[PDB]
Amino acid sequence: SPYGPEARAELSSRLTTLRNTLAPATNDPRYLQACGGEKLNRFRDIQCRRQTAVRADLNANYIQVGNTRTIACQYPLQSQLESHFRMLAENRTPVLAVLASSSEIANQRFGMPDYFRQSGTYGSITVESKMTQQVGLGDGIMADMYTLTIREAGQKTISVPVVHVTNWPDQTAVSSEVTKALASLVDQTAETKRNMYESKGSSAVADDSKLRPVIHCRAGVGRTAQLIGAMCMNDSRNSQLSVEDMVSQMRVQRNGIMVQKDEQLDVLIKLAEGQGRPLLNS
Numbered sequence: 001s002p003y004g005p006e007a008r009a010e011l012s013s014r015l016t017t018l019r020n021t022l023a024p025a026t027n028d029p030r031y032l033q034a035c036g037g038e039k040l041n042r043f044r045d046i047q048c049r050r051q052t053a054v055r056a057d058l059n060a061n062y063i064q065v066g067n068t069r070t071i072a073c074q075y076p077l078q079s080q081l082e083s084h085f086r087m088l089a090e091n092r093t094p095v096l097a098v099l100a101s102s103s104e105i106a107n108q109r110f111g112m113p114d115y116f117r118q119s120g121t122y123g124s125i126t127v128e129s130k131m132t133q134q135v136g137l138g139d140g141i142m143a144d145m146y147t148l149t150i151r152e153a154g155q156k157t158i159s160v161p162v163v164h165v166t167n168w169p170d171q172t173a174v175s176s177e178v179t180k181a182l183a184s185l186v187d188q189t190a191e192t193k194r195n196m197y198e199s200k201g202s203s204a205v206a207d208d209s210k211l212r213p214v215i216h217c218r219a220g221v222g223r224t225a226q227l228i229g230a231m232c233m234n235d236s237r238n239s240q241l242s243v244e245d246m247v248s249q250m251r252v253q254r255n256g257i258m259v260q261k262d263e264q265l266d267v268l269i270k271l272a273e274g275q276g277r278p279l280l281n282s
């Protein structure tokens, strides 16, 4: 009854209205606009909320869902990589979760540079990739872990842990069990990296805009939103926060497409009901 079809239908009705009203107008004041002709948005219909935008020239947003703070972004375009690495280093990123599959990255029709599995040089930034462990998440889903070392003359060298989910296909929802296992692995990776900074007395530990997990897939609204939703529900400080509020916050802070497919919302609904967490605001 609280997770019955009538309550599910009400939740869908509310989120669809919000999705429809957040669709971007041409030169929409709510959304970050491209500058001097350079391409900003990987997909023209999937834009970057201006108020929460992390950098002028990235499609990337600060996300706060109840108490959980992350960054969600699109897969960076080739032109955006140097700026993308700057954001990663400046945020002292405690984990980068890449949810785009090995098959999508390999398809050169998609323009998805292989920026975390190869070493490379992007303007003044030098990046070293090292492959570390591989972790099965269940149901055949696999995670490859990397460390990206970001170097730049005159800058503090920053190392970033990477969780790469290699085979979660676009436009699908992995299972609730897999989703919980992925969220646990991403949170634990982030906690280990935060503990390191804290053990060195790092002043970045006290800045809320910093030490945020960075999560992207191809567009940054589908597999990304499912993972953020699960990470939110795994934070004990977010007691009583409803699915409606959780998805509404993601949409008003990024775009109206957050939680792209019904199947992805269905996994958030399963995870909520397993917690006795409300679907709707009262």
Ligand code: VO4
Residues within 6 Å of the ligand: 170, 171, 217, 218, 219, 220, 221, 222, 223, 224, 260
């Ligand atoms: O690359 V995603 O379509 O799951 O936003």
